[PDB]
Design an enzyme around this catalytic site. Sequence first.
Site, short mmCIF file in Angstrom:
data_model
loop_
_atom_site.label_atom_id
_atom_site.label_comp_id
_atom_site.label_asym_id
_atom_site.label_seq_id
_atom_site.Cartn_x
_atom_site.Cartn_y
_atom_site.Cartn_z
N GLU C 38 57.23 44.87 36.98
CA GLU C 38 57.66 44.41 38.36
C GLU C 38 57.74 43.13 39.17
O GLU C 38 56.92 43.11 38.49
CB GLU C 38 56.02 45.42 39.03
CG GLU C 38 56.27 45.26 40.90
CD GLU C 38 57.44 46.05 41.77
OE1 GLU C 38 58.41 47.06 41.44
OE2 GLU C 38 57.50 45.55 42.49
N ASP C 98 38.70 40.02 36.87
CA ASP C 98 38.90 39.52 38.32
C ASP C 98 37.20 38.07 38.98
O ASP C 98 36.45 39.22 38.42
CB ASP C 98 39.17 39.32 39.56
CG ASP C 98 39.35 38.32 40.67
OD1 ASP C 98 39.57 37.31 40.12
OD2 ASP C 98 38.83 38.82 41.82
N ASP C 100 35.28 35.62 41.36
CA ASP C 100 35.31 34.67 42.21
C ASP C 100 33.88 33.67 42.27
O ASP C 100 33.58 34.34 42.31
CB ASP C 100 35.73 34.88 43.08
CG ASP C 100 37.01 34.08 44.57
OD1 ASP C 100 36.73 33.02 43.88
OD2 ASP C 100 37.31 35.07 45.49
#
Lengths: 241, 392, 372, 156
Positions: C38, C98, C100
């Site tokens: 994808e 992830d 942050d």
Amino acid sequence: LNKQIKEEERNYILLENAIDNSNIQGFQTIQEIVQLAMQRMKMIKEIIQEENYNRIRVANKFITVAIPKSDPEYELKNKQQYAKEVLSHFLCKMAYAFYAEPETWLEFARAEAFILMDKLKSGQHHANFFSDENLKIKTISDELFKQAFPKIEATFSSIKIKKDNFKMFKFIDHPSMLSNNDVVLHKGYIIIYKESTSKIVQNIFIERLLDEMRLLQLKFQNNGSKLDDDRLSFLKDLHKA
Amino acid sequence: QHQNSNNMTIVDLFEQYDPNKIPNYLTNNIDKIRKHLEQRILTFKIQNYSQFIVNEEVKMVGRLISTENGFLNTTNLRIELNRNQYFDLVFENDFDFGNNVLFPNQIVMVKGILVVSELITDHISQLIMVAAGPFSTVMSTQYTSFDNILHVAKTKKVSTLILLGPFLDIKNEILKDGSIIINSKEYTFEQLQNSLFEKAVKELEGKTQIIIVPSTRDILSTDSIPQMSLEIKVSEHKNSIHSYSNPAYIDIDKLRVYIANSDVGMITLQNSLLDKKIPYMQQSRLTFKALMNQQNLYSIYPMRNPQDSQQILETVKLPNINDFDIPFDYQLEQYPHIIISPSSLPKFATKIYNTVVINPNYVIRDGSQAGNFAIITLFKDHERTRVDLYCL
Amino acid sequence: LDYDLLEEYYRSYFPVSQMVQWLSYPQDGDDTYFTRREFSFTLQNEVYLRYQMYNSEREFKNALLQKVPEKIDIGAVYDRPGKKGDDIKAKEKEFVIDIDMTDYDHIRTCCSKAKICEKCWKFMRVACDLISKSLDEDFGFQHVLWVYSGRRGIHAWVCDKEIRKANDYTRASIIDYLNILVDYVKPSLLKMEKSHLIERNAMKQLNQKKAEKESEKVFVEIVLREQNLFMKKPEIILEFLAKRSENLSKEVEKEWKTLKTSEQRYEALKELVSSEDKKKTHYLLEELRIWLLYPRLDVNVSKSTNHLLKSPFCIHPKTGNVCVPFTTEEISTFDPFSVPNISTLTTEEGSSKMKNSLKIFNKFLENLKKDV
Amino acid sequence: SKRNQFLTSIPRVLVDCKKCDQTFLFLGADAASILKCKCGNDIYIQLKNKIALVVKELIRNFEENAIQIDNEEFEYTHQISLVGKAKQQKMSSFTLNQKLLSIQAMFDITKEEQENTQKVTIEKIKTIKKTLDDLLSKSQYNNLNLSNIFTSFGLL
Ligand SMILES: [Zn+2]
């Protein structure tokens, strides 16, 4: 002769395929099946309410009867006993698979799993699951036994030790057991005590048994409802008790 | 004579249900009826009507049912084929009508844009005793006519006798609602039947064979019209007595007789429609011709009482009645030698399709003492039988 | 600003063949690995292109150059190619984590919550080694690929033989184990017993029986904290201390008003909580340090077995950053101020910079191509 | 107890005795040991005959099946069509089974009560009981063969 005894025993403990009751002397009329289906649901509800399992079965007479071969009409006793357990389970399963939500089948899965453990524990032979659990258990290597020795003794403190630690598992096979606080993890592999071999038995049994209900529900959702009246009105009652 | 009775050797041919596995004893379903009828219409279409027709016109076979719940009229007869084809018949424009009989549940062939065919089958020393019930005078429980019937039977030294019809019916014992006798004793139904049959066997001394056929109105047999085996309990042990189903087909030494025990002719004639200006004897002849075609006399399912739609004279279990069907193809054999159809039609004895039908009406008919019965004599050496009817 | 990007796309994204090889996985022996993967692109002014599957690399770069892809995404691999029809089921996807700087906003105070400061990157510096140590010690996971992203923290790509085809339930089970900062303190599952395993190693306190020891464990968090905020906001930790008896909170708040110095305040707190009970106070330093230092793992993007992510080397004029690659051994040396940018042009320094970026990337690329 | 829910549906059973007649709400408050009227007579024979007649009438009433006319009409017909959509019997087998079971249960006796009386009365009780017990045993609705109810769902 002996082979069909073995197959009927396998179906008795694993309890996955049904039988016919028309020719059986006892359970013929519509009235008897009502109380037969009520008794098991009562036992299941009280089991889940209280959390003694063998002491429960003695209350509801569900023990496999003991009677000598010399007793007359011997074939009646075991046929009656075999009929009770097999017929009881499917009728109870049929109720949940049709009306209860998938977030409500877990109560039934736990109850049947727990009585399964009692049957194997008091049972003479666990060979039905003994062969398959060999496929899952893997003996701890002595290299890994010393590799995580400080970690192993950290979690394990009380005794109620090389052989005490039990054969280990691959991480991918049983991802659900990592969240348990009693297991030790080291580079994608898990080491467990021997008494949790009962816990893994319920894990696979629940997953497969829960799978059938969704398939059973799927085979019903494509239709409207049960077609014959004397059962549809009946199975609805076996949900609330 | 005595040796002739010694060499009777009676036997039947139907397959009798095992009394513990009646297929539809109580449960009834609509869908199974539809499937069975859809199978049988195709069976008739494939087997019988196909030999007449080669494939603007249209041809089909179907079942006849009444459009309206009321009694049928020439404008409301309707033909049905299957779950989909669903039509009417309008052949009344020309007022033409053939020599055929139409009744509900009949399966006929019709073609048009109209010609109707009715499944036509291609054309071709001993004495017996026949007696019909009831045996007790209305509002009485003496059963004295039984005495003179057996008096005649043992006077004429008949080889065997057949007793048929209700014995204890719902039309005589409902008034009594009990049993009281001169010697101050109380009796029940079964003891009364035992007394009657002991009287029969002791008067006949077991010298003759006896055939008993129960009927619907009997109070002891609760079953529907295809009832079976009215159980006989007797003190005498010699096997001179016998029991059979309601529609029977028994085998004499070489004689095969078929019994329609209850009022089929009258109901079939009155319920059905037929052309006028036809004599009554011809009416009965054509009604029986129509019934013989469909391999079973109990062709009509509703068979409602004339002029009384709500009342049903006889109860017939539709799925279970086609078992007793018997086919007629004289190219091989003539299957029913004698047809016994006790009904309120006028007494007769005639020959159809090289077989004979007799109608010995009820003894003590309508409460009057003027009973009647019949006897038959046949000689074997192909098929010659002498029949005469007796009035009391 | 799109003309400079259109001129610069011939230079922005060198690793075309490198990316194809990384997605190819030649060791498995199956073909059309790039075909099933994808891809999603973002164009100027909200225009979104999805399922831009390209079977050939040539047409891939042709479309990449012709259009204006302000953002380039990476997706999963499906049954068969094609889009918005036949409801294709995905086979495989790589494991992602992830990180942050938003979850550290309530702790730090020296920055304006919109732009980072040099005093804040130490949290990422410690989080990287924490998570890498967790993955390496607890799982096999012989391959790791971090990526710095934009104006904020980083991600954690992973490539391995087995986990690529893992189902969603195993993904959830893995991400459950690595999350300890349960939202308000560390869950009781580990508090209930002593001699635990996970957070002891997660606090840089190895198996030990001590002034030098306590100093060598505390100095890390001392350097990270007593310069950025140095306990300027007492309420932040007084609220956590209120979980225990009100008497201890009253004692510490009465004590603190005199010292008015940060490190001495911390030492006084340690002394006042060291020996005031044996059971009522338990690990009381440990949960405080974990809550005040450990990073909160995101569970939004890394949740589903299929998702979209910001690819390496993506460039977005707002903030002028280049998502340069990373590797486990690069933790001790990386900085967020030496990264290349669109602004540099015809400059040897930036040339050497992205040449270093490519060599660091190739390090892991042939490391994987040889280790497979 | 278990007797009210079967007393609530019993059909009429009137016994004609000397100089009196009474409805037969027998149970087994009621003295189950003795079944005789206020008179000296045991009214056994009339009871047996009345049971025979009432069961015959019930069966004959059932066998005349009639369906409910469509378009929400309460009229009924005995002529069933091949394309008929509606399906509802006037007297479904459930009602008859319930009535027969009630008439059976209104005459039974527990083992505790029978041992205190003479054998003649209890043997007469079972003689009357079997007349309905055998009729119940042969039904195709009371007896249930439940293989086909779930073998369509993939079970042996
Ligand atoms: Zn009285």
